[PDB]
């Protein structure tokens, strides 16, 4: 823990001329990225090379596009420095505040709290859904394409030392992506990542901060309802979701509900693919045996 902090303390002040680190802690990790709070009052992101390229040039893009074109009061990041090279990537912004909505806050709420919290969250997903996105056109997002060429990789890859099983649930999977009509919709900006650890409370309980905008992009609405829509121990429940779409209005929910159950399913591939690109197998190993997992539930 402590050496991390030393060579990040480092790079930051190195690649940032007048920034002085006075404190600094890890406050989170992704699989390729880490997470820092400095000087208690700054979020610097950080990542070392990885396959996705230009990961942190577009959420830049991203932040600096919302910042100048939502009209909101709920606070996102705003990025004060950057470094962006290959090897190494780095953003920093002040530290929104507030306290992460999870299911345990929602269930202390009352009835009417649960609304205000559901229309904001329903409001912001319109005017961010609304946007015209021409100023950030590159950064679209296909996800059908994304998973054929993922499929491809596979069959060039491990796909023919997978087992029957395994290769069976695939094949399930690329049948219904292949029949469904859910890609077809309502393409917008979305945040794509939009789950409940990463919307932010003020002391009322109303939405205040949302962050983590590292997977957004211009892709199908329904996306950013996938989470709103689980059912899970980290996600507050699909009643949750279904009150925040009537609230946003004009969606299919069935459609938005078959999205998400997409989703979901191809949970145990892209962890496969994951493993590939990264060569990581243990990744390959754990979507190999959800596969198992799945299989045999029920
Ligand atoms: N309170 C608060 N916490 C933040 C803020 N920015 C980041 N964090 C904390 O740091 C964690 C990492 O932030 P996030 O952008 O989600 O990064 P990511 O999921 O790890 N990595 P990537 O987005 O590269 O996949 C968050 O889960 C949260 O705990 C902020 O502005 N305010
Ligand atoms: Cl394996
Ligand atoms: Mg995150
Ligand atoms: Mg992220």
Redesign the pocket.
């Known amino acids: 823990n402590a050496t991390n902090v030393k060579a990040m303390k480092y790079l930051i002040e190195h690649y940032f001329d007048n920034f002085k680190v006075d404190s600094i802690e890890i406050?989170?990790?992704?699989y390729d990225?880490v997470?820092y709070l400095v000087n208690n009052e700054y979020?610097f992101?950080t990542?070392f090379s990885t396959n996705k390229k230009k990961?942190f040039a577009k959420?830049k893009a991203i932040y600096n596009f919302l910042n100048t074109n939502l009209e909101t009061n709920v606070k996102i990041?705003n990025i004060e420095y950057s470094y962006i090279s290959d090897e190494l990537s780095i953003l920093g912004?002040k530290?929104?505040?507030?306290t992460?909505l999870t299911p345990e806050i929602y269930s202390t709420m009352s009835e009417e709290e649960q609304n205000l919290l559901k229309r904001d969250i329903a409001s912001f997903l319109r005017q961010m859904h609304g946007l015209d996105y021409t100023d950030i056109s590159e950064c679209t997002i296909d996800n059908k394409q994304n998973v054929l060429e993922e499929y491809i990789l596979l069959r060039e890859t491990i796909y023919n030392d997978l087992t029957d099983i395994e290769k069976d649930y695939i094949e399930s999977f690329m049948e219904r992506l292949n029949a469904t009509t859910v890609f077809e919709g309502k393409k917008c900006l979305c945040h794509n990542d939009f789950s409940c650890?990463?919307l932010?409370l003020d002391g009322n309980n109303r939405l205040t901060?949302i962050?983590?905008f590292?997977?957004s992009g211009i892709i199908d609405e329904y996306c950013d309802f996938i989470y709103l829509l689980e059912d899970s121990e980290e996600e507050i429940g699909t009643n949750f979701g279904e009150d925040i779409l009537r609230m946003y209005g004009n969606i299919d929910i069935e459609k938005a509900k078959e999205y998400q159950d997409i989703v979901e399913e191809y949970y145990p591939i892209e962890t496969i693919v994951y493993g590939i690109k990264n060569i990581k197998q243990e990744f390959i190993e754990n979507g190999r045996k959800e596969i198992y997992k799945r299989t045999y539930k029920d």
């Open positions: 406050i989170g990790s992704g990225s997470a979020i992101k990542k990961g959420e990041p912004y530290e929104i505040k507030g992460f650890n990463h932010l901060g962050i983590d590292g997977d």
